[model samples]
Target chain A: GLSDWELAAARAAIARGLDEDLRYGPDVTTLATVPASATTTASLVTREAGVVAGLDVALLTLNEVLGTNGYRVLDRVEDGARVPPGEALMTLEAQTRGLLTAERTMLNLVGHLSGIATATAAWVDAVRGTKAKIRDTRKTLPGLRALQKYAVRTGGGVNHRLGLGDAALIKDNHVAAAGSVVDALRAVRNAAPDLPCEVEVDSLEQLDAVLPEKPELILLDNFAVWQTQTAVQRRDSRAPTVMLESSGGLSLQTAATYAETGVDYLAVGALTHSVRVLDIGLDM
Target chain B: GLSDWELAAARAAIARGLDEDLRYGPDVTTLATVPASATTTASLVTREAGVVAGLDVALLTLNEVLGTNGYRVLDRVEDGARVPPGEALMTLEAQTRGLLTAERTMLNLVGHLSGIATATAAWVDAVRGTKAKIRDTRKTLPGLRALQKYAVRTGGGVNHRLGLGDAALIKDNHVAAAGSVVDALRAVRNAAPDLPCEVEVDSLEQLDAVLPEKPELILLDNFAVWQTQTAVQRRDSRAPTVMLESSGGLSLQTAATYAETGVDYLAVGALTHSVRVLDIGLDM
Candidate 1:
């Protein structure tokens, strides 16, 4: 579950996906193949075992990918259940071809979704005792962005940036595009006065350049420990209680050290894209 | 990579995602209350090891999450190699906070994406001796549809049916909505005259309605060997170019039998999502 603000941001991305790729019903001829009385079964097997999520997307994929199948799905597992190897997650009995054709399409949804849940569970388990929260990044596979983020939630992790329109991030490119941090901030402000501007400064030196035009959030881009500490201290918490996020070259090994740095949040992209699927297998 | 036709479908979904909740970047901040930094020599651990893809995403998350010298990533292994349990995938050297902040996010991408690649590789290997090609399904996490599918390709699998609109499929819903399969086909033809269509049929009985109208392709959903043989025999190789797809109830155990059903394609949604992340980890 994303916050209203985050949800609004995420929806924008989902809209792009729907417009560009999401289909309706099944393949072209599927309907003609289905009769009034036909019992077809769509089975969900564990490619390997782990947790499952994104059942909603799997259902939606089948609906569009197959289109027919007055499908009767037997859902043995709901979202977030730890499934064993070779277990049946669910089954859809419908028009044979509808279920068959949509099989890969639908499974793609369930697999990745469940993969996120399983991976997230591990990360959650890792950071269980600490205040450190596992968060997802923008590294999600393109179209399935919405469901991937959702899986992160089902797995009990936080989501990072959703898209470009809602947030003004002054990245290296933005700085290059605008020629300066101050200029980028000024340009963003001039264009959208109300939008919150987050400036990314790489050094203590750049902090001065950014602090002048008070940004809504300050990202200490790859700053060293002393540099990060001094920068935060010097800012004296003056800029709108600006959230501090440190991103770049992070791993679990250094989690505690970073957490101790007193930053608000650490942005890690791996949560969404790099997480290894837990070692659960499906043997049929 | 998708064909122009397939890309069109992928793009349609992309448009939807962009509209829905596409976050280009994050608006992050720091806590300001934590300590400066601590001495830390941390090693990145691998949950499962397999060939790595999406390394860029992992590096980005680490750099962003930790703010530690951009957390330079040294891939001790190449992209398409195998690793052992204790293998160090990559090492992160920076302030402790930076590493911890990015721990989950970085691994999330590595673990999940590699899982897909690993799982897909298994499928690829299974169908190695045969002409049967493995492909990804529309089943994927919402935002990660594109990247996850790409991972399938990385693991040597083809992609299929990115979304609706591009591919016209008549599944059970259309049958229910139209009251009958024939009625649905008529409506679809009337609305989109030039679009390609794939029909789903289960038992041989459903073939009666489809024979009358010359269809583009017939998806023999979930047909057992006998039913598939019956449908192929009845088609007489006329009208649509026959594509007998055996989906539903598919898993590693059953994939071979389904593949042997003499069908042209077997759709497996697990290629992208269901497959577990390969055994890969980061090491210091």
Candidate 2:
């Protein structure tokens, strides 16, 4: 048992995690599998190349939550290691029904997490040089930011923010809502002066308006290469956007081009929800 | 006992809601007010006079998860029913620290939900019509969309779409990404075939490229009144754009004016995240 703080934290997280339906109670159409009469064995196979993660949570999901302590691990893939295809990451001896029951969910966590790691790996590899890092955006699946970002860092990427309260990011809407970018930046600066602010600017021209606030980070929102060059040149260290980030319309293919913009952080939303799982399957 | 499907749905949802914190001792900075051997009680209060929702889940945070069945719902508010000032939604009799520890979190659910309900109600009131409707955007907290949108319905506003799977939104990015609006939408149409798609066009000229896809909805992103008027005039009577929507940066003072722009729906995010809850605290 994890203790009061640990257990409380797990309880809190699990409580929230339970808010959405991810249960696979029964599969219809055919009865290939039945509830375990007693104990049995199972095999877990990786269909693609990626790191295996959330193994602890996956184990907890099956054994602890359901009281079916029936699995054994064979190969323990460390959280941040690379794995090739057709690898048997682990094999579990369990009640037949419980293994079948927990298989989908186990894969759900493992595969989704592995997918994030793979995606992060790709992005991190893409922007390894020129001082730019691959930071995760708030464009995450509703409750999965932590795990996704964890997978990001696990795959050598950085976390841009945890939530709205953690950082002050002024998007175009915030600019309009507060009447102008200057006003938005001024207001955030006035309220939380010490708080580092990141302004999302679509054009290089807005960079001039941004000069007054002197934000430590300027999110080079949706700027192309030439525009990014102008932004870097215009900045010229006076209000140099040291942690410049280029985002919007970013795919895995184009992430590196923006990396070439020489900004400090290249944030991408695709690393979380949009990335396809590396595909791991459980077999009997 | 809840079905695995129900539990899984909720768990998957909540998992998506919280960000991953590597050090998972406790999310709360301050421990709850409770003695080591004594139990605590945290009551659900109405912050503003609107409606009560998600009391069961809050109570579940104690009983089912913590094994503290001392949680008793002294009163249950009908989810959508309007709450008056000083209303008792429910009360929890449990371990003091558990109750205290779960206070902000429990209330985070109750408050946010009720706040969304209140804001949704106001929008519903503002756009009262047989032909018109108020809708929520994908602009939701990542994991909490289902719950938040559920609150929207509880408050009287309708949901636009659950996510990319449920509907295709052709934003400025999609148009740019696919090389042309028509090509982008064509690709989506080809892929899903039967998927309901909405295209967001900021300018009148872009509508030309958008004309071919025949998306189910056309979002006039940040369009002015005159342009909306012109587009309405130019569109074919039988074109899919009949479900035209005017959205982006809409406010209370200007809500009616945007509503007057002949747009079928006005999308808002503040209703879910930024709305103030009708506060009514629980007194033990």
Candidate 3:
């Protein structure tokens, strides 16, 4: 089920997408080719195996293009479900013109979100059987972070900070300005007090310096596998409650090795930033 | 210069982004740490050499966060300019709290769009000296297509179709529904006789069949370099006026090879879908 906020975001996105398509005029090809009175059935099918997400958004898109009275959903799989190739995610009966008009918008939204979910699922699978959890960064498309993070959740990945205000993240630039990792961490604590904070450190020295501060989390920025292992040991010895996250220079092939180093999380930006869309299409 | 519509779109995006950060409340860390009257100067610098874009959007972001009275833009490189590492995209002096709060949002928007522009420029460079031009597909992030396409233009790549209605693109699915490439082409002509249309074909036989009808453009879908070369010859022999576009399986490494085959456009969906964000950051 979509939250009210998520639903609102989807609707806003839908409005913009529909405007982009219809600003020129009605879909002339559909109007000219499909008879005005014609009705047809179409199935939204996945052409490849992947996790499915945004079925609700897809239905909402349909409802927008073809009024609620113009279409009926015959079937749909729940979001977060692992679906096989050639599986039908949803089936709809609709007026031919409206269906054709809605086709691309529906595919675009579903494909993009499902792509995030699918990629997240791959990361999730890669680090399986480890204490490490997968998390997404704020490196998402503008105006679509919430939905993209939701898709990551559907694929069994956890989300990092949704925005700058939600949590305090002291990255390299922050450290550079604040003078040191410890200074930046102290600054965040003095400023927000109760807000959860994560400090990113590029080297073990910074890690050693920040561990005593016991921030909610410490991100090991670009630590090699051996260095990550060393960081895990240091955290366990000094601040067992402080969670460690491994980020940067990570890929599917090396995820398990990094995860096995006992870091609590792997922060993957690509889950939203550079995923390939799942191949889903509408067929009559 | 940002168009009125692009400006409006950028504003809307900035509004949504600011809401995402502030919805939890004003940036608690910035509010707590920086004095209310404190002001500072910062530079938006590119960490890597690349073509810069979205400076206008970045400025708009600053205006949204630190009211026009709160900040001054001391300097900036024009959008679409190729900038070297450490080059300042913009130098701003603003209320420190406002500047810090606006930092991530500004970086995110500029980095994402500049990433697209940089990627597009690479493709444009790769296809240099050839008649073929780099073009972006409609496979763009929903709600951000226009901005993304603008970035492509900044990188010297052309835009394919902005949306479904702007141009009639009869891909394989359309051919499947309409019975054949020729039939799909006919359907578009019959529906909107004056509309521009591009028809995609997976095989040379389909190309031969559609060549006689002379659609405005014919896309060579997933054709190898040699096959694309063959398609170019056939098109030149039959209908030189029908523009040939090589799409599918394109990459910067192989762009020149395909361009040499004599296609008019190289449609790269990755221009928007999967580009790496240019490393741009704000430094105080």
Candidate 4:
């Protein structure tokens, strides 16, 4: 189920999508070909295996174009469920013209969110058996961060932070502005002690310098495997309570190697930033 | 300049983005560290050479977070202009707290749209002398299609259709449902004869069958180099007025090769579906 705000966001998105298509006029082809009174059944099927997500959003899109009384749902699969090729995520009965008109929009939404979920699930599976958790970055498509983050969670990945206000991330620029990692950490602590703070360091010495300050988390940016191992060891000896996150230059092939190094989290920007869509289609 | 509707959409998107970060509470770190009235100047710079888009959107976002009185734009670049590495897209003086709060969101929006523009320019440049023009599909990020399409146009590429209603694209499913290519074209002609229609054919035999009916455009789906060449030759002899589009399995490396095949357009879904973000960063 979607939260009230999420539903409202989705509805607004649907309206925009509809407007983009119908700005000039009606779906001329559908209006001319399919009879207004004619009805048909269509199945939302997956052409490949994936973790299902955004089914509710897809249904909402259908309802937006077809109306509640214009369609009947015959079957549906829950979000986050792993599905195989040829699986029907949902089946619906509706007027043929409306169904055809709504087809691409529904496929576009479900396929995209499901793609994120599937991509996240792959990362989740990569680091299996390790304590390392896959996490998403705020590098998401504008106006779709919450929805994209939701898809990441559905695929067994955790979210980093919703926005800049929710948590304090002191990256390289902040350190440069404040003169030192210790100064930035101290400033954050002095300013908002209750908020969790994560500091990103590009070098081992910088990591060592920040560990003593005991920030809530430290992001090891672009760290090699051996360097990540050293970071884990350093964190264990000095600030065992503080969590460690590995970011930058990570790939699916090397995910387990980094996870095996004992980092608490792997921050992957690709999950939401640039992901391939799951091959989902509408079958008549 | 952004149209009223586009500006409204950007404003709504910015509000949603601000809420995502500020929902839990205020920006604790900024509030605690910087004085309420403290002001500083920053530059939005590009780390790599690329085409710029969404400068207005970025400025609009800055206005939303910092307020018009809180910030001043010192300098800016027009959208669609290409720049060298280390180019400053925009420079702004603003309250430090508000600037820091708005940093990631501005970078996210500008970088994402600029990335699309950059990718599109690459394709557009690839087929420079050829009659083939790079075009984007409906496969765009939900709620951001208009923005994305605008970016595509900014990069020198054209848009195929805004949505289903703008033009009739009789794809494989439509063909299957309508029984044959001729039947589908006939149905659309009978229903909405004024609407521009494009029929997709997977085989040269199917292409031959549809040429007699004379679609406004014909898509040669997944045709190999030689196959595309043959389709072009056939179209030249049969229905010379009909335009040809090359789609499916297109990449930048082979884009010129396809363009050289004498097709009228190259439909690249990847222009919007999955594009790398241009490396744009904020400098203090």
The TM-score obtained by chain A of candidate 2 when compared with the true chain A: 0.83
Q: Is candidate 1 or candidate 2 better by DockQ?
A: 1
- State each model's TM-score restricted to chain B: 0.72, 0.77, 0.97, 0.96
Q: Tell me chain A's TM-score in each of the predictions.
A: 0.70, 0.83, 0.97, 0.97
For every model shown, what is its TM-score relative to the native structure?
Answer: 0.49, 0.49, 0.90, 0.91
Docking class of 1: incorrect
Who is ahead in DockQ, 3 or 4?
Answer: 4
List DockQ for all candidates: 0.15, 0.04, 0.41, 0.48
Selected candidate, larger lDDT, 1 vs 3? 3
* Per-residue lDDT over A1-284 for candidate 4, one digit per residue giving the tens place of the 0 to 100 score: 67887788678767767776677677666565556887878899998998999999988887888887789998888999999999999988888888877777777777888999999999999999999999999888777877888889999999888877678888765676577887878888888777899899999999999999999999999999999999999999999998999999799999999999999999998898777888787888
Off by over 4 Å in 2: A1-37, A65-70, A177-179, B1-284
User: Which residue runs of candidate 1 sit more than 4 Å off their true CA positions?
Assistant: A1-49, A61-77, A82-98, A176-179, A208-214, A224-240, A274-284, B1-284
> lDDT per residue, candidate 2, B157-220, as tens digits?
8888654345656554345445677766776676656557677788888865575556788888
Per-residue error at A19 for model 3, in Å?
1.4
Which digits, one per residue and each the tens of the lDDT, describe model 3 over residues B112-161?
88999999999998989999899988777778877888899999998788
How does candidate 3 score on lDDT? 0.85
Q: How far in Å is the alpha carbon of A262 misplaced in model 3?
A: 2.1
Q: How accurate is candidate 4 locally (lDDT)?
A: 0.85
- lDDT by residue (A187-233, candidate 3, tens digit) is 88987787898888999999999999999999898999999999999
